[PDB]
Amino acid sequence: QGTQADDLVSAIQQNANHFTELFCRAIDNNMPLPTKEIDYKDDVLDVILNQRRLRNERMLSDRTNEIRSENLMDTPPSSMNDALREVVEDE
Amino acid sequence: AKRISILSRAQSALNSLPTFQLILNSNANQI
């Protein structure tokens, strides 16, 4: 196609241990949602991880609600949306 | 102050915030 791409194959072949977590992070950024619902025939690890994801979402939503309810400045919607997302994600 | 400062520099367009000093006054009885 003519575009420039780095030699990812040689980098994996020389330093595969780092690229394991690099690929795992890249997969975790782009994860499709589960089409079928969770049921009683699923793995115990599966329900634990589902509960962990739901608890993470609920913690983020609760902290978002608390920071929005405090109304620190009482004041560009995307600006304080991104800033509040940052303060929740590092709080 | 940490959550005030994050909502400050990203809206009115690294930063390290030290531990804030407690200063207190009063008008009670002076022994």
Side-chain angles (χ1 to χ4, degrees):
Chain A
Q1 281 190 31
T3 182
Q4 193 264 331
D6 280 26
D7 204 344
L8 185 61
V9 186
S10 189
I12 290 173
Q13 293 179 356
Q14 290 252 24
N15 196 0
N17 200 82
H18 196 119
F19 278 94
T20 292
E21 291 85 4
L22 269 185
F23 266 86
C24 281
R25 179 148 66 82
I27 278 178
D28 291 331
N29 296 115
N30 63 6
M31 203 51 192
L33 277 296
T35 50
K36 78 175 186 68
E37 68 270 13
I38 190 159
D39 77 5
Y40 288 93
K41 292 181 181 179
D42 268 348
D43 181 6
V44 290
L45 188 153
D46 277 343
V47 299
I48 287 158
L49 270 64
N50 180 64
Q51 283 181 9
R52 284 173 180 170
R53 292 180 179 91
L54 289 197
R55 181 66 178 171
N56 275 352
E57 288 160 16
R58 199 175 49 197
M59 288 195 250
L60 286 183
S61 179
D62 291 331
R63 189 71 74 199
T64 300
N65 278 8
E66 295 201 344
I67 301 299
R68 210 182 292 272
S69 161
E70 287 297 329
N71 272 331
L72 300 185
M73 320 181 152
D74 199 4
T75 51
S78 297
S79 166
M80 73 291 291
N81 281 138
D82 291 331
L84 192 151
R85 187 183 69 85
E86 209 275 332
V87 71
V88 167
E89 79 181 5
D90 69 352
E91 179 177 356
Chain B
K2 214 187 197 150
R3 67 184 62 182
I4 292 188
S5 296
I6 284 153
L7 299 165
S8 301
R9 59 90 174 173
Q11 309 195 23
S12 83
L14 296 174
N15 289 338
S16 181
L17 212 58
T19 314
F20 273 52
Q21 165 169 47
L22 182 152
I23 301 166
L24 61 83
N25 311 315
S26 80
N27 295 343
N29 285 349
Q30 292 162 32
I31 62 170

